[PDB]
Enzyme design. Structure first.
Site, PDB file in Angstrom:
ATOM      1  N   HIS A  86      -0.358   0.803  -2.557  1.00  0.00           N
ATOM      2  CA  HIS A  86      -1.462   0.080  -3.199  1.00  0.00           C
ATOM      3  C   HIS A  86      -2.749   0.142  -2.331  1.00  0.00           C
ATOM      4  O   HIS A  86      -3.603  -0.801  -2.354  1.00  0.00           O
ATOM      5  CB  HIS A  86      -1.071  -1.394  -3.563  1.00  0.00           C
ATOM      6  CG  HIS A  86       0.123  -1.523  -4.504  1.00  0.00           C
ATOM      7  ND1 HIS A  86      -0.013  -1.845  -5.834  1.00  0.00           N
ATOM      8  CD2 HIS A  86       1.459  -1.396  -4.284  1.00  0.00           C
ATOM      9  CE1 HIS A  86       1.183  -1.923  -6.397  1.00  0.00           C
ATOM     10  NE2 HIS A  86       2.088  -1.642  -5.483  1.00  0.00           N
TER      11      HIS A  86
ATOM     12  N   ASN B  68       2.862  -6.021 -11.111  1.00  0.00           N
ATOM     13  CA  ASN B  68       2.442  -4.669 -11.513  1.00  0.00           C
ATOM     14  C   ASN B  68       2.113  -4.687 -12.994  1.00  0.00           C
ATOM     15  O   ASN B  68       2.364  -5.696 -13.635  1.00  0.00           O
ATOM     16  CB  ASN B  68       3.535  -3.649 -11.245  1.00  0.00           C
ATOM     17  CG  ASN B  68       3.571  -3.207  -9.726  1.00  0.00           C
ATOM     18  OD1 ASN B  68       2.581  -3.355  -8.990  1.00  0.00           O
ATOM     19  ND2 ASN B  68       4.684  -2.609  -9.310  1.00  0.00           N
TER      20      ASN B  68
ATOM     21  N   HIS C  86       1.362 -11.687  -0.627  1.00  0.00           N
ATOM     22  CA  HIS C  86       2.802 -11.562  -0.270  1.00  0.00           C
ATOM     23  C   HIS C  86       3.617 -12.469  -1.206  1.00  0.00           C
ATOM     24  O   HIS C  86       3.385 -13.677  -1.251  1.00  0.00           O
ATOM     25  CB  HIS C  86       3.021 -11.878   1.243  1.00  0.00           C
ATOM     26  CG  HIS C  86       4.458 -11.790   1.670  1.00  0.00           C
ATOM     27  ND1 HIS C  86       5.115 -10.596   1.881  1.00  0.00           N
ATOM     28  CD2 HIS C  86       5.392 -12.763   1.821  1.00  0.00           C
ATOM     29  CE1 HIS C  86       6.386 -10.843   2.185  1.00  0.00           C
ATOM     30  NE2 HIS C  86       6.584 -12.150   2.124  1.00  0.00           N
TER      31      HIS C  86
END
Ligand code: HDD
Ligand code: HDD
Ligand code: HDD
Lengths: 726, 726, 308, 83
Positions: free
Chosen positions: B101, B174, B365
């Site tokens: 990414h 995603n 995260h």
């Protein structure tokens, strides 16, 4: 809820003497002591009381005692993000220590000039006696790591970060007026030679080993700073009682563009004082934090370290009027030739809150100058300018170290530099380059001028070929060592002799000892013979014939080079051990403690155990430390009051306390039956200089004691101490 | 002063359509768009106007054009600390990019729930519809570096950092509802297979190479996500027109401690839309920053990206009710089985000030959860929890990455963690450990509870042996690919066919293509045959005879899996190219722009040169770009107005403009003499669906255009485009 | 600038008692002492005799005494790449020390089992009394920095890297059989309590301060290892005269799959011996390198440290 | 120093000289060379001053800068001849 109900866990937020209260972060100990830098750090100070324990992402933790596991006796789970954050932070706590001066102790303070120096410099911080400049100062040793001991024999660093209205100025100096070497290209050679040897990483904090004296013996330019380090200058009593020096010639530039050469000085207002070697070395074992502790506690007690900034000033026209080169950093400028002009006063009045964050991360660099100052071609200074920027890239993790809070300017800073690791500032400028039209070219260049102008270098003339060559003017090595030698008192000279003898005795290859001794014979034959006698070496007739080097511009001595030749003692902040017994004469103790308090001298009450003792009149005396717990190394003098002397008369620690203080030339005072301790130190019935004795601690007893303390040590005792087994 | 007289260097601080103004840092563009996070960043925002250019130490620079040298044609001097600081910062600007990414584009905004979710979760940010949570959202591709192109075929990331009152919650998702692999241990293998191959570091931003297809062919668990990537899902029109998914089953925990399985969804309020492959690929060359530009421009125009947060909720008792495992991240939960409950809305309404400081340094995260949420045993999620913390230690230079401004919580954070590189927080707590008495144990643990409680994991039962073993329930690879295939429209199916065909033709080792075609025969024979025919492969008998996998819980399709089956097209923020001539009929143009404005559709006026042209009535029309400079790739439709059509009739670039748009299935509208361009694209006299034509640009002609634009592309045109040479 | 005529600059390459000769790098003191790991380091060992002084890029230096300047009293020039490489290397020498056990002293050696342990473990390094495994061992204190003193009162570290035919095994233990705390989650708490206190970074190499004893008084689980630390175990005479222990129960797994719980021990063949507190304390001042030195010198004498 | 992680970037295999390289520099992150020289400084006697400086010469000689003449003031100024 675990604090004692009586609140005794928390030190009083008011000045208190060493040992009376537990030490604390500066902002908790002294909340009302402020300055513009300390105030500017408020955005990053983090409290604790009444707050929930959290992760770094702000999530409240319920159980900070356990990892997450499958069953209470099961394996730890990878999904325990609280454990992993906490251990990860711990796993990465350390950053590289400083390559040199890794061991250092720091504090906050302020500086103010006595008068405007606009005639000689346009530097904004020296322009107005009412302009207060915050400072942050770090004192240090040189060789040892950050966990090495304080009272080693070494050079000390004295670095001052001035947070001025026109930029940070870092004055990064040492406690002697010269350095060991002439050109920066040799700095890793010198530093490698003095540091622990590379096969085995020994010795820590000591130049007393083969590679150092090998280098010295092969590089006579080192001899001048070596003499300083072998003298008691290498073992200061306290950071508060040593001199500071910039070392190099720099320039001041006034508004008319006139350059004056300058060397920088710090004068300790508490006087110059050092330890003696055996005391210093033993103290590295009994309290390896002694200087760090003493600095912190002096500040907590209100005994603020104070220093007077002073300038030796030399007109441009006089560059070449001395027997030595002004740009040679192994040469000092004798004050007899060029006096120090007083410039202003610095007071260190607040400890940090967090040592790692403020002290360990502080970055000082002598290239950080401001308009009104400039460099010279001193070839050591010249290479320093490269090192202090470069080294922060690994030590502090990248080029944004000026954004670490202690390093930040308090004045405006704006430019077109961007990114880098750890970038804190979020630039809103449409432009990251100049010239630009898209932000009307802001921020803009500023022409040089009398005040608030741009930095422009002084247009010194340069003429020569591109060469790797030492100036012939630097090629003289012995006259300054000899000037230093001849300026020291007879006892100081003995301690230099003993420094060399002790260090060279640790050099395993005898040829290196011989070669150092031969170098000493080029400085002064008395010094060289005295060292040779201690090493069982005999000078050759040729060595006995070396002619001494010339005087320095007609000087055969300069008393300002001695710690002690000109009395400058000050007892405030000093400390006395009082050896108690189980039935002290309370009147003696009332007079002792009040006399000490009147002069700002501290006391620690000592005994064979902790807890309390009761005086003759029922007064409860709290015990600070045991005789072994706080050895005479840690005090400036010892007083034994009257009472039940038989309680301690046969105590080995009590007797040894006096022996150790006696050997280390410290004043000792004995009242009433405490005089039976005279036998332990072998004092004549009729008494001796340096031992105060009376029926009681009344009348002139305490005056006589304070007078001895004002002269620091009893140098006249030196011939008596050789026989004493201590 | 370098700015122009007329102030045209500085964009207006008000919303403006794409290309009307130069783009600008978000605080200068939209100074009054505020949220608690943007406001809290004010302590590190740095301005520029009216400030002096300085070093980082605050020293004013007089000459930012020249190095210090000996003579104006002499060597540069080491004492030039201004030059070296400026060059040192430059030399260290770059930090490691993200492992995956690395290419991404981010914006600030806010989230607000539609209703209290306290019945199913205690998460404070979902407790009340009037609770506004600032967010920072980064969209990304996966494979390519930070310098790669936007419109590649790839999965896209969609990461939201929620700055809640009870901690940072990072939802790291995603644009497809599953991942390629089952177990985190295989992540480096998959990522190495898809990334540039190790000998020569080719190809960038592409799965179209041997190692990717080799891995897929040997690991059929990948086939589900590979179907998504090979569809038009892999080539979104805009980050605003794609879906988002958490991928994994997580848990919500309410105040009673009941757990509900949840999968997260983001539904784009601008609807779903993708490019077609030829257009996407060509667009990587014509504008590799197309998505980054489109996002930044949508926000500057007030076309804020908006998404509805959705939960698919599954009671704990229903864990085993499907014919796939809920914890298998290669399996989706069909919305026909578990509907998406719409829970709140996120609106992205401000761009960053500095891309590096806020976007490149942001750390997201999925282990960053808050009380009211918890994990599951999904073996891909489980290993993620290790990685996103670990990777920041090199990428952001140490464990204080949460002190980087964009990363800081806006809620309180206090704990006993200390030091680490670039430590910003100066801790005043006397204690750095617990339990402690010296600070009365603060900061203190907090018991879990209904609100403001400490985090406690859901006490899930764990029973089994320590094993490295894939769950047998994860061993089904074909039925979800098939369900996805069967839910696509016929033109979506044909694009998936073309995606595999194109990709496999770039695999050099033919046996890999054959092995991939075998895997497709296990999914659907029609798909396998269509791709085989484009590769010159014939299916064997065995392959024609592979029984299809079973339906998913009786579903033979789910139209929520298609981008286009259920119309949800929104034209606001789309863009039309208008091809100008040197005497445009001003009446056509007035009506056109009025009708586009009414629907929030933007226009770019295009010509064969820059500057302006003049309408029939003398209206001066400024030109935004040339035909070649702003290709049809960059717009959603093309209108050609009437006027002097002869001026552009013979222009190759203007004809090609139309051919390109036609081939890529974009609506085209032609008024009056502009209908002569029908010849270039071979349209019969009687017209074609998707070509709007009329004597003039009346109200009807615009409605027709705008209806076509709401349906995104003219899918019915596909059989006419392969005859077209463009 | 050169060696004495008589060759006295150089230590004999033979075993010699402590103090007889200057100490020296291992490969020069004992060139014929080898094992597989020592030999495998030969690719990176760099000699010095008879070689020209160079930059890191291999360029010979003519003058390593001076910077390049414009005239012999002029400014240093930025084009002096020799100066800058040398100074840059020096400026970047230091790396972060270990969070704990930063002070430590290491040596090479070898291990062999007395008999095959294949009945209890399939570990290859315990399978054959005649298969030797190279080792590298580091001993350490816990609390103090890399430049802190050796003869402090502290737990000692005893870490052994075994270079086996089937992987590196690190047996990372201490000189007492337990630790102060039960759950790793508390490690930062205990370590911060024992370390120098965060306001002033005092005291180095000592548990004798308020935070440590505050933690101990509030966490009775610490009391077992505290008793060891306050005993003479906390002040060994030498690394050669202390015990080592792995601390935790591990498992041995044999070829049949059977697991046996095991706790690891090292017995000093030179016997157990410790200092007394007044001696150990004063020794941290008279020779802060005492255990480092004594280990290096014992190995140069042939008094090889041995452990069972 | 940041790109390649410290001052030992010349030991990364592609960057290594194929000709001899010996000097008194030590340590630094990811140090590969293990120095056996008893000395890490010069001048030294304990390794007879090795590795040694080499005078400039027609071949295999030490680096010496060409002795160009420098003359002018310390200025931040563009040469007019560049304008
Ligand atoms: C060319 C190399 C070089 C040379 C010739 C010098 N220094 Fe230096 N010094 C450094 C290279 C260095 C350094 C590697 O850059 C240090 C260690 C880490 C730091 O940040 O700077 C440093 C630290 C350092 C410190 C500690 C600052 C602190 O408290 O953090 C002081 C006080 C001095 N030096 C003083 C001096 C004096 C008075 C010198 C000569 C008169 C001298 N240095 C020459
Ligand atoms: C254990 C390896 C691993 C696993 C299996 C995954 N990731 Fe990941 N991901 C990382 C390891 C990683 C990473 C190395 O930690 C990254 C790159 C750098 C970083 O900050 O995180 C990252 C970045 C990253 C980003 C970019 C965040 C940003 O914009 O900075 C997104 C959106 C995702 N991941 C999403 C996912 C999804 C939806 C996954 C499966 C459902 C997934 N990742 C599995
Ligand atoms: C969870 C944290 C943690 C815990 C609970 C322990 N350790 Fe540890 N230890 C570390 C975290 C750590 C470390 C932070 O990972 C170190 C410092 C740096 C290094 O490389 O490892 C380390 C170093 C370290 C060393 C020095 C290795 C060397 O010479 O380089 C030894 C001997 C030990 N430890 C021994 C132990 C023993 C016997 C423990 C319990 C019985 C123990 N440690 C618990």
């Amino acid at each position: 809820s675990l604090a004692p109900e009586d609140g005794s866990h928390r030190p009083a937020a008011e000045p208190t003497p060493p040992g009376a209260q537990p030490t604390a972060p500066g902002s908790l100990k002294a909340p009302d002591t402020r300055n513009e830098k300390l105030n500017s750090l408020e955005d990053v100070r983090k409290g604790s009381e009444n707050y929930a324990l959290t992760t770094n992402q702000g999530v409240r933790i319920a159980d900070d005692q356990n990892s997450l596991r499958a069953g209470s006796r099961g394996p730890t789970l990878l999904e325990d993000f609280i454990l992993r954050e906490k251990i990860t932070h711990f796993d990465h706590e350390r950053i590289p220590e400083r390559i040199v001066h890794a061991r250092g102790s720091a504090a906050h303070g302020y500086f103010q000039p006595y008068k405007s120096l606009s005639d000689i410099t346009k530097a904004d911080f020296l322009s107005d006696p009412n302009k207060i400049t915050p400072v942050f100062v770090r004192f240090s040793t040189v060789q040892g790591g950050a966990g090495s001991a304080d009272t080693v024999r070494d050079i000390r660093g004295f670095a001052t970060k001035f947070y001025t209205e026109e930029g940070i100025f870092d004055l990064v100096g040492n406690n002697t007026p010269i350095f060991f070497i002439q050109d920066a290209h040799k700095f890793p050679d010198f530093v490698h030679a003095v540091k622990p040897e590379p096969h085995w990483a020994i010795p820590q904090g000591q130049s007393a080993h083969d590679t150092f004296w090998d280098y010295v013996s092969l590089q006579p330019e080192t001899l001048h700073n070596v003499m300083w380090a072998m003298s008691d200058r290498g073992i200061p009593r306290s950071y508060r009682t040593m001199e500071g020096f910039g070392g190099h010639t720099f320039r001041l530039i006034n508004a008319e563009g006139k350059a004056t050469f300058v060397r920088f000085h710090w004068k300790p207002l508490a006087g110059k004082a050092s330890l003696v070697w055996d005391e210093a070395q033993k103290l590295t074992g009994r309290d390896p934090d002694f200087h760090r502790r003493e600095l912190w506690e002096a500040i907590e007690a209100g005994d603020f370290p104070e220093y007077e900034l002073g300038f030796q000033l030399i007109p441009e026209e006089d560059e070449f009027k001395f027997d030595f080169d002004l740009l040679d950093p192994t040469k000092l400028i004798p004050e007899e030739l060029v006096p120090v002009q007083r410039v202003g006063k610095m007071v260190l009045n607040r400890n940090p809150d967090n040592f790692f964050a403020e002290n360990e991360q502080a970055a000082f660099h002598p290239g950080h100058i401001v308009p009104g100052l400039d460099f010279t071609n001193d070839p050591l200074l010249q290479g320093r300018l490269f090192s202090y920027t470069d080294t922060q890239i690994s030590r502090l993790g990248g080029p944004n170290f000026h954004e670490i809070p202690i390093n930040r300017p308090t004045c405006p800073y704006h430019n077109f530099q961007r990114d880098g690791m750890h970038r804190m500032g979020i630039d809103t400028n449409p432009a990251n380059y100049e010239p630009n039209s898209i932000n009307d070219n802001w921020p803009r260049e500023t022409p040089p001028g009398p005040k608030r102008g741009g930095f422009e270098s002084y247009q010194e003339r340069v003429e020569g070929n591109k060469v790797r060559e030492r100036s012939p003017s630097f090629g003289e090595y012995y006259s300054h060592p000899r000037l230093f030698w001849l300026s020291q008192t007879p006892f100081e000279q003995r301690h230099i002799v003993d420094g060399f003898s002790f260090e060279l005795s640790k050099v395993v290859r005898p040829y290196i000892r011989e070669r150092v001794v031969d170098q000493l014979a080029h400085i002064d034959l008395t010094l060289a013979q005295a060292v040779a006698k201690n090493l069982g070496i005999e000078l050759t007739d040729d060595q006995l014939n070396i002619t001494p080097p010339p005087d320095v511009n007609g000087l055969k001595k300069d008393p300002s080079l001695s710690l002690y030749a000109i009395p400058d003692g000050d007892v405030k902040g000093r400390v006395v051990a009082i050896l108690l017994n189980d039935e002290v004469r309370s009147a003696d103790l009332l007079a002792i403690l009040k006399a000490l308090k009147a002069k700002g001298v501290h006391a620690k009450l000592l005994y064979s155990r902790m807890g309390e003792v009761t005086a003759d009149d029922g007064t409860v005396l709290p015990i600070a430390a045991t005789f072994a717990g706080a050895p005479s190394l840690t005090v400036d003098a010892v007083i034994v009051p009257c009472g039940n002397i038989a309680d301690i008369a046969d105590n080995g620690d009590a007797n040894y306390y006096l022996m150790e203080a006696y050997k280390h030339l410290k004043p000792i005072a004995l009242a009433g039956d405490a005089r039976k301790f005279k036998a332990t130190i072998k004092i004549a019935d009729q008494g001796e200089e340096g031992i105060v004795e009376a029926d009681s601690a009344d009348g002139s007893f305490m005056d006589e004691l304070l007078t001895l303390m004002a002269a620091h040590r009893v140098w006249s005792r030196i011939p008596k101490i050789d026989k004493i087994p201590a």
